[PDB]
Design goal:
The chain is mainly β. The protein has one domain. It is 0% helix and 28% strand. The protein has a two-stranded antiparallel ribbon with strand order 1-2. Belongs to the cyclotide family. Moebius subfamily. This is Kalata-B1.
Length: 29
Amino acid sequence: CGETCVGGTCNTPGCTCSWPVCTRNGLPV
């Protein structure tokens, strides 16, 4: 995802909050 869910959520679509960073389909992209 490249995004960070330091807040507890992800802005990027289909991106999960994989604190501290974000994730995609359970994979950090």
